[PDB]
Amino acid sequence: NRPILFDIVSRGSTADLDGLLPFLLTHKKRLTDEEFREPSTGKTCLPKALLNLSNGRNDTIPVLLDIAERTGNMREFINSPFRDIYYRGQTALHIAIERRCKHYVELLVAQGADVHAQARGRFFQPKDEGGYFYFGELPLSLAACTNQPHIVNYLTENPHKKADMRRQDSRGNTVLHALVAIADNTRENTKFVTKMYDLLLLKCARLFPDSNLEAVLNNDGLSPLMMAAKTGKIGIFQHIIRREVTDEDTRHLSRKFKDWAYGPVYSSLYDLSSLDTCGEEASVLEILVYNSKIENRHEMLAVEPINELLRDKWRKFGAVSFYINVVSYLCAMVIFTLTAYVDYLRLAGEVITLFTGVLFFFTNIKDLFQLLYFIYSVLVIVSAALYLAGIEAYLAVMVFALVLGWMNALYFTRGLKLTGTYSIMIQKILFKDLFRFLLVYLLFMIGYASALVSLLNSETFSTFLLDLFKLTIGMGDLEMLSSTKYPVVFIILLVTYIILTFVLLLNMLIALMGETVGQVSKESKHIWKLQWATTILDIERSFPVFLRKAFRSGEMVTVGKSSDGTPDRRWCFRVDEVNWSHW
Amino acid sequence: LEAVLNNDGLSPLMMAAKTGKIGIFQHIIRREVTDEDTRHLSRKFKDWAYGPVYSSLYDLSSLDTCGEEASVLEILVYNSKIENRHEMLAVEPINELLRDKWRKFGAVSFYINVVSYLCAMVIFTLTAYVDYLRLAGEVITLFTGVLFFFTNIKDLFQLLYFIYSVLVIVSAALYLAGIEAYLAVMVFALVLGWMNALYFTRGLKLTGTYSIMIQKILFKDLFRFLLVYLLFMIGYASA
Amino acid sequence: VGQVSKESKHIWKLQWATTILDIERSFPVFLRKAFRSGEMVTVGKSSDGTPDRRWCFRVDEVNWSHW
Amino acid sequence: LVSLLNSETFSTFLLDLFKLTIGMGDLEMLSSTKYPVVFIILLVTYIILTFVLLLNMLIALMGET
Amino acid sequence: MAAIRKKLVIVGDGACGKTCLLIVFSKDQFPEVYVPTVFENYVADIEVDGKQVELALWDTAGQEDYDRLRPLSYPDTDVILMCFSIDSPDSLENIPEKWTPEVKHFCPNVPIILVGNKKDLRNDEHTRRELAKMKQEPVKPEEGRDMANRIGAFGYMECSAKTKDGVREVFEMATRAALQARRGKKKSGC
Ligand SMILES: Nc1nc2c(ncn2[C@@H]2O[C@H](COP(=O)(O)OP(=O)(O)O)[C@@H](O)[C@H]2O)c(=O)[nH]1
Ligand SMILES: [Mg+2]
């Protein structure tokens, strides 16, 4: 019976299988029948045999294959997938590869086993989706992921049925995508992954001269380099960016060339294909600092061709055009300041004030703490309706908005290098500590106001509250105290309340420097570059294609004669480095 | 053998946790033995592996809540008095257990306990102030204070909370009397409640450090400084 | 605060741990039993023959080093 | 603040506002205001903003500078 | 270039020729002696318009115990051939009644091709006499056309396994429909 066969397969004893074929032929049963398969997952005999091995050797496999060929169900026998959601789609070849049995992998390949079978069960998804191990759901990608080069070589060089390296799964990821996915920042992992990546790329180049594997994209539309940048896998991204290959036939696949040297000074070209602004395709630099959500983002800018690109951009826009954007808000602030205040000219400027607010809102909607700026734009609106009405409350709206504008000036300070750290520190304090401290203090103050009211024994509370604020200033006299049923208790409390409000706020400053600014102090320089980078990117985004094309960084270079014969002309950005060591 | 207990009722693992002997406790928790006959004596088993990912079981016998026997985790953070207590939580099966607990209660149920004190604060705030409904709420105010005291006595800076509960009591007797001094008692208690809100802030991750820092300053430095300053001020007043 | 600054993260976990413990203590045995962490697993056949069934909490760890 | 009150009228306000920062001077401006209700919150808010930004300077000075 | 894998599944009443229809498509040889209850784990190569597609053909039967396991063949389905028999009118009316709700329940927003098999038998004297015994007639093409529009069918064709008539075109349209990636989403949440 099925349990007996499963136990026999578990032991590995070929002798116990004797007589199986006569039984099956007499009963006209198949090894893929439901009875023999395990109902829970559809598991067949061969997976059970593969999962158990004695010193990596199981003698039942050939007999199982022989009887499966005898009955004539070998195709169904080897292609039978698991149907459980947990292990959906798994086949014998997946187990054979996972167990590092080269000879068994070769045997299964020789016996017509499907080589493009997918395993899309929930156990094979990424961590985010609840799965445990993700490798691309292909046997070739599985072999590549688990550091098994011989199996990759065999699968790609077998005579019976080769496995196209370009094959894509349901997600659209190719083998390179999976390699990027499983990589991490640990040194050994990055080393092995890089070696596997280079071997795979060269093999694909030899097999497919016309095509370029990295060009292939997934359903989401990511190239391996772009995904590596997004997900934060630093090592593989750095290796992909500085790929250099000596082989002449595959020279076009590498990125960083070396043009000339004059002794201790070298000048090496780099490749900005899919790495620069004003390009229709997504930019790696842009996605690295727009939707990265990577904890290693700060270290991703240290790469040679990445860091310098921003300085070259800095010359064009950074240091010369920040003035203009700053000045625009200064002029808008003046136009608004004229509000409170040549009647015709004054009215024209008054119209210009509403126009400037509307322009700020129009560019705000296009761009979408810009929610603060959104609040400013929101507040501008009500004034026009109430001004047409003649209502008297439009002044309050204008007050809120005006103070918001002068406060927005701080955002302009942030862009400049000198004030870049101070502005960000002020904002962080206002958001992390200051916000929570104010939130708590407001409720505490309201409750203590109620306590003071009780001691005095809505309007009676309003007078007390306003005069208590004056008391905090100290200008106001103690009118409340005189009209109190029990001042003796209140007097100590009133001093105590002031101490508690102040001392908790005094602690905030101590809390801010270490608890909140402790991490800011260390990473401020990295954050400032990020802040500078985001500001630089927005300037280029605003300019239209013609304006962007005016200042495409780097110089076009014909790296060398291509296979077609027309030299490959990447847009390259030269990098100059000198090094006395070596020759 | 490990089952055997002393007169005090401690197993070797529990005593190791209490006294702070880190190394033996870590070794006892992650004991793995290859021998088949003695396999049942070890704790951490390994169920399956699929390549570079492994999933190993652990043993929570005498290491989890809702157990009649004393919990090692509970005694490690209730009566430890160990200078290495912070390093005892780094052990693999110890640290993760709290995150698994965190999903069930930590991140979803802290709101409710916080909100209970907020509602009690509102009920009390109604004190100073539909006559029948208002009187019912007034009774609810004393009931809420009494409930806070009843749960306080059961739990025993909860001595501050005890002070709040203590102060609630006098008000009922004086309210029946009609005396005029119950207001002072209510004032003390009301300010104590709004201050207690800080304890609710402490639980949240965002305010967890700020609340504790404020308390520590109020206890270590602020307390002694105020104590000295009061006497200095009295003497200078005499001068 | 010199010692508080260094050990605040450790203290916060302790503070978090104490708060978590009190919540479970309040709930009665039935409520606690509702959310016993881990999954019951029969580790293996015991000497008696009935498999030993400890209440086990699985831990997932990956490691490239070794095989 | 001048707009809320609704050159010399600004000079009086400015000098008395400096006195207000000191606290010796009385709130003469507030009495002569078309919309004090909005101003009252703002006047406190303005003082907080001036001081808190200056308070941050001390924090900025010790570490950043 | 690089073959794209598309999953095709056939659902229909028994004895309407589903297994035979796939079999003729697979080896182009009518089995005159032995027909398995199900034809599984086969992938066929087809090119329609400049694209090479590997079509994985699943098969569902419900004679005995297969109905319990039928649902777990639906996941990750790319295209469906809902099949019925032209020489058996009883098959048609059950499609809207029972077959459609199950298909929609387990796998919605999937293309469906409603097909009627064995066009030869509608003109057969034996089948015509048998249906006339109950005052019935073979399923008219008009009824099939109306049904296809009624239940949102992608296309309606007719097959003949014995004569190998229209099989290539039917599966050609099936994969053409499969290659379309639906239309985004409808009434998606925010
Ligand atoms: N004469 C004739 N018989 C057919 C044809 N196609 C199918 N059949 C008959 O239909 C019977 C069952 O069809 P089958 O493949 O089992 O359909 P299924 O039960 O849905 O899988 C077979 O025994 C065939 O003889 C055809 O084109 N001509
Ligand atoms: Mg069949």
Tab-separated table of N, CA, C and O in Angstrom, chain A residues 476-527:
chain	number	residue	atom	x	y	z
A	476	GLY	N	0.681	90.800	33.151
A	476	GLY	CA	-0.629	90.905	33.773
A	476	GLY	C	-0.553	90.767	35.286
A	476	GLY	O	0.310	90.077	35.828
A	477	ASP	N	-1.471	91.444	35.969
A	477	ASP	CA	-1.577	91.343	37.414
A	477	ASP	C	-2.395	90.113	37.807
A	477	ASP	O	-3.110	89.521	36.995
A	478	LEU	N	-2.281	89.735	39.082
A	478	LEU	CA	-2.971	88.558	39.616
A	478	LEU	C	-4.392	88.939	40.036
A	478	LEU	O	-4.730	89.045	41.216
A	479	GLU	N	-5.238	89.152	39.027
A	479	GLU	CA	-6.644	89.434	39.298
A	479	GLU	C	-7.361	88.195	39.821
A	479	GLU	O	-8.209	88.291	40.717
A	480	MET	N	-7.034	87.023	39.271
A	480	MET	CA	-7.682	85.786	39.694
A	480	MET	C	-7.510	85.559	41.190
A	480	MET	O	-8.479	85.273	41.904
A	481	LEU	N	-6.273	85.668	41.680
A	481	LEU	CA	-5.981	85.322	43.068
A	481	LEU	C	-6.916	86.042	44.028
A	481	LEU	O	-7.429	85.445	44.982
A	482	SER	N	-7.152	87.333	43.790
A	482	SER	CA	-8.011	88.102	44.685
A	482	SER	C	-9.391	87.468	44.801
A	482	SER	O	-9.966	87.408	45.893
A	483	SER	N	-9.939	86.992	43.685
A	483	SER	CA	-11.273	86.389	43.667
A	483	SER	C	-11.154	84.867	43.724
A	483	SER	O	-11.456	84.149	42.770
A	484	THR	N	-10.693	84.376	44.875
A	484	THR	CA	-10.521	82.947	45.091
A	484	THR	C	-11.056	82.552	46.458
A	484	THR	O	-10.762	83.205	47.464
A	485	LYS	N	-11.838	81.472	46.486
A	485	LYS	CA	-12.324	80.944	47.755
A	485	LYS	C	-11.179	80.400	48.599
A	485	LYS	O	-11.142	80.615	49.817
A	486	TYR	N	-10.238	79.692	47.974
A	486	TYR	CA	-9.119	79.059	48.669
A	486	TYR	C	-7.826	79.400	47.940
A	486	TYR	O	-7.317	78.596	47.148
A	487	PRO	N	-7.271	80.589	48.175
A	487	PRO	CA	-5.989	80.935	47.545
A	487	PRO	C	-4.808	80.237	48.198
A	487	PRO	O	-3.795	79.979	47.540
A	488	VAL	N	-4.934	79.915	49.487
A	488	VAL	CA	-3.813	79.335	50.222
A	488	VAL	C	-3.316	78.078	49.526
A	488	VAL	O	-2.106	77.877	49.359
A	489	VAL	N	-4.236	77.209	49.113
A	489	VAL	CA	-3.849	76.034	48.340
A	489	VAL	C	-3.395	76.444	46.945
A	489	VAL	O	-2.439	75.882	46.398
A	490	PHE	N	-4.074	77.423	46.344
A	490	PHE	CA	-3.768	77.808	44.969
A	490	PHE	C	-2.364	78.386	44.846
A	490	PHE	O	-1.663	78.121	43.863
A	491	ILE	N	-1.935	79.177	45.832
A	491	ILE	CA	-0.671	79.901	45.706
A	491	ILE	C	0.478	78.931	45.461
A	491	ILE	O	1.288	79.121	44.547
A	492	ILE	N	0.572	77.880	46.279
A	492	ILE	CA	1.597	76.868	46.049
A	492	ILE	C	1.384	76.204	44.697
A	492	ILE	O	2.340	75.960	43.950
A	493	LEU	N	0.132	75.890	44.365
A	493	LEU	CA	-0.146	75.197	43.114
A	493	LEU	C	0.229	76.048	41.909
A	493	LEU	O	0.824	75.550	40.946
A	494	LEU	N	-0.116	77.338	41.939
A	494	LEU	CA	0.151	78.195	40.789
A	494	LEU	C	1.640	78.246	40.484
A	494	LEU	O	2.048	78.136	39.322
A	495	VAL	N	2.471	78.411	41.515
A	495	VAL	CA	3.912	78.310	41.322
A	495	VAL	C	4.288	76.911	40.854
A	495	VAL	O	5.095	76.746	39.931
A	496	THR	N	3.712	75.883	41.481
A	496	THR	CA	4.044	74.512	41.107
A	496	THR	C	3.675	74.237	39.654
A	496	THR	O	4.439	73.594	38.923
A	497	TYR	N	2.508	74.714	39.219
A	497	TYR	CA	2.099	74.504	37.836
A	497	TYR	C	3.087	75.142	36.867
A	497	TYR	O	3.462	74.529	35.859
A	498	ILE	N	3.518	76.373	37.150
A	498	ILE	CA	4.473	77.044	36.274
A	498	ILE	C	5.782	76.268	36.223
A	498	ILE	O	6.376	76.095	35.151
A	499	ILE	N	6.255	75.791	37.376
A	499	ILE	CA	7.477	74.990	37.401
A	499	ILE	C	7.316	73.751	36.533
A	499	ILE	O	8.201	73.410	35.737
A	500	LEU	N	6.188	73.052	36.676
A	500	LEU	CA	5.989	71.814	35.933
A	500	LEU	C	5.946	72.066	34.431
A	500	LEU	O	6.551	71.320	33.652
A	501	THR	N	5.235	73.110	34.000
A	501	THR	CA	5.200	73.434	32.577
A	501	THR	C	6.592	73.767	32.058
A	501	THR	O	7.006	73.288	30.995
A	502	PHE	N	7.334	74.591	32.799
A	502	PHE	CA	8.656	75.003	32.339
A	502	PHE	C	9.662	73.862	32.421
A	502	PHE	O	10.437	73.647	31.483
A	503	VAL	N	9.670	73.117	33.528
A	503	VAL	CA	10.703	72.099	33.708
A	503	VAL	C	10.530	70.979	32.689
A	503	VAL	O	11.514	70.441	32.165
A	504	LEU	N	9.282	70.604	32.389
A	504	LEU	CA	9.059	69.629	31.325
A	504	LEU	C	9.538	70.174	29.986
A	504	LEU	O	10.111	69.436	29.175
A	505	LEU	N	9.314	71.468	29.740
A	505	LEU	CA	9.825	72.088	28.523
A	505	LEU	C	11.339	72.253	28.576
A	505	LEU	O	12.010	72.148	27.543
A	506	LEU	N	11.894	72.513	29.763
A	506	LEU	CA	13.347	72.545	29.903
A	506	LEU	C	13.952	71.181	29.601
A	506	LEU	O	15.009	71.089	28.964
A	507	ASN	N	13.302	70.109	30.059
A	507	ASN	CA	13.783	68.766	29.750
A	507	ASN	C	13.751	68.488	28.253
A	507	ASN	O	14.574	67.718	27.748
A	508	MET	N	12.808	69.101	27.529
A	508	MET	CA	12.725	68.881	26.088
A	508	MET	C	14.031	69.259	25.402
A	508	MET	O	14.506	68.541	24.513
A	509	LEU	N	14.625	70.387	25.800
A	509	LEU	CA	15.898	70.795	25.213
A	509	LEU	C	16.981	69.759	25.483
A	509	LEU	O	17.769	69.425	24.590
A	510	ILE	N	17.037	69.238	26.712
A	510	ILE	CA	17.977	68.162	27.017
A	510	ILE	C	17.641	66.923	26.199
A	510	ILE	O	18.531	66.241	25.677
A	511	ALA	N	16.351	66.598	26.095
A	511	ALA	CA	15.945	65.442	25.306
A	511	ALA	C	16.285	65.633	23.833
A	511	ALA	O	16.699	64.684	23.154
A	512	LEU	N	16.110	66.853	23.317
A	512	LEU	CA	16.293	67.083	21.886
A	512	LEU	C	17.738	66.860	21.458
A	512	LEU	O	17.996	66.221	20.431
A	513	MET	N	18.698	67.379	22.228
A	513	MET	CA	20.088	67.327	21.784
A	513	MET	C	20.587	65.890	21.686
A	513	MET	O	21.272	65.528	20.721
A	514	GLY	N	20.253	65.053	22.668
A	514	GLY	CA	20.776	63.700	22.702
A	514	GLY	C	19.853	62.648	22.122
A	514	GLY	O	20.269	61.863	21.264
A	515	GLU	N	18.599	62.617	22.581
A	515	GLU	CA	17.671	61.585	22.124
A	515	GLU	C	17.298	61.782	20.660
A	515	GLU	O	17.256	60.816	19.888
A	516	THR	N	17.028	63.023	20.258
A	516	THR	CA	16.597	63.341	18.903
A	516	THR	C	17.741	63.780	18.000
A	516	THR	O	17.833	63.320	16.857
A	517	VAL	N	18.622	64.659	18.488
A	517	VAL	CA	19.732	65.157	17.679
A	517	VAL	C	20.953	64.252	17.733
A	517	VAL	O	21.903	64.468	16.962
A	518	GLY	N	20.966	63.250	18.613
A	518	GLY	CA	22.106	62.344	18.664
A	518	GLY	C	22.355	61.657	17.335
A	518	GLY	O	23.489	61.608	16.850
A	519	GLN	N	21.296	61.118	16.726
A	519	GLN	CA	21.419	60.529	15.399
A	519	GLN	C	21.512	61.583	14.307
A	519	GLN	O	22.119	61.329	13.262
A	520	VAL	N	20.931	62.762	14.528
A	520	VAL	CA	21.032	63.837	13.548
A	520	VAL	C	22.457	64.366	13.485
A	520	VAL	O	22.976	64.666	12.404
A	521	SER	N	23.111	64.493	14.642
A	521	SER	CA	24.471	65.021	14.669
A	521	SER	C	25.412	64.159	13.838
A	521	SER	O	26.261	64.682	13.107
A	522	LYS	N	25.279	62.834	13.938
A	522	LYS	CA	26.203	61.944	13.244
A	522	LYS	C	25.938	61.926	11.742
A	522	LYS	O	26.880	61.935	10.941
A	523	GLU	N	24.667	61.912	11.344
A	523	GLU	CA	24.276	61.751	9.950
A	523	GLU	C	23.902	63.069	9.282
A	523	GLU	O	23.350	63.053	8.178
A	524	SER	N	24.189	64.205	9.921
A	524	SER	CA	23.814	65.486	9.329
A	524	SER	C	24.510	65.699	7.991
A	524	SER	O	23.890	66.161	7.026
A	525	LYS	N	25.803	65.369	7.912
A	525	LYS	CA	26.526	65.538	6.655
A	525	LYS	C	25.926	64.670	5.557
A	525	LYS	O	25.747	65.129	4.424
A	526	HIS	N	25.607	63.414	5.875
A	526	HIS	CA	24.940	62.555	4.900
A	526	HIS	C	23.560	63.098	4.550
A	526	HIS	O	23.170	63.113	3.378
A	527	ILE	N	22.808	63.549	5.556
A	527	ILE	CA	21.477	64.096	5.303
A	527	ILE	C	21.572	65.353	4.448
A	527	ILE	O	20.753	65.573	3.550
